[PDB]
Amino acid sequence: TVAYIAIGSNLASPLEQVNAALKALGDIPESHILTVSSFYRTPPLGPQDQPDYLNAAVALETSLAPEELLNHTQRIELQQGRVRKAERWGPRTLDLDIMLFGNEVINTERLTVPHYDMKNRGFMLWPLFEIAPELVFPDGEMLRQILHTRAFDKLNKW
Template identity: 60%
Template sequence: MAQIPSQKRSKTRSEVRCYIGLGANLANPVQQLELAIAALHQVPLSRLVAVSSLYGSKPMGPQDQPDYVNAVAALDTTLLPEQLLDALQRIEQNQGRQRKAERWGPRTLDLDILLYGEQIINTERLTVPHYGLKQREFVLYPLAEIAAELQLPDGTVLSSLLEQVALNGLQKLHSSCS
């Protein structure tokens, strides 16, 4: 896990700690995540505070695609949830992401807002906590690496979820390049 040094700046709104899931399985996935982490440093009104190690995981859904590389980042931001979503989608597009109808298909980069503070959000564009957060080993284990004591908005303790979710071939690849 990499801890990022804090940066001083003026605050207009109070910062919210967000957790972002990163995943890629096309076009050199490790490099895609490294570029995404560099781009997260540039998100306006935000500060990258931690990044998990990179993990290798089997694909969800169709198995006729390459394995994924995943990580989780902690970001403090004053952006509103949908502003943060817009910023993440710009990063995806800049790295060649093309949104297709196929769910769980291969992709150059996938950035998901897993948690936005303690908020529960359910809009047409955004569901937070992320709907798959509690079941996905490739999210839970990297998240636990950077936020071991985390409690979800519904009161669930992260460590209790780890006891219920199998590794399913998840492997730590190496520390991130934050």
């Protein structure tokens, strides 16, 4: 199943954190990377007193189940010193977020898919669109349309 993963980092040299993530991800069992988007520098979504983010999107083919994929990505995060912080949107070495999991819709204790609020987030939407311009969400909403009917800010490349 094609799992679209969003990679983010704005601490401990984002480019290295991201390359690391990309190596571990393909190292995931029964999985391989179809595609990776470009590397983008994006402004913090919340508080501004932190560095810009490196953001990317990956198409990972995987035979793992959704929450099984989460155990794996979360290991990698932990491996990259990502810290559980109280308040959201503060900075962090690594984020591996499952944006979409095939065409599925998951609303479990641990997993919400498609990722909460991702339809309002250019740092998630632009890389994704780069690698799947033809993508349609489970509710039928088309990605190219979503990106067309609001002038979401253009991404600068990292």
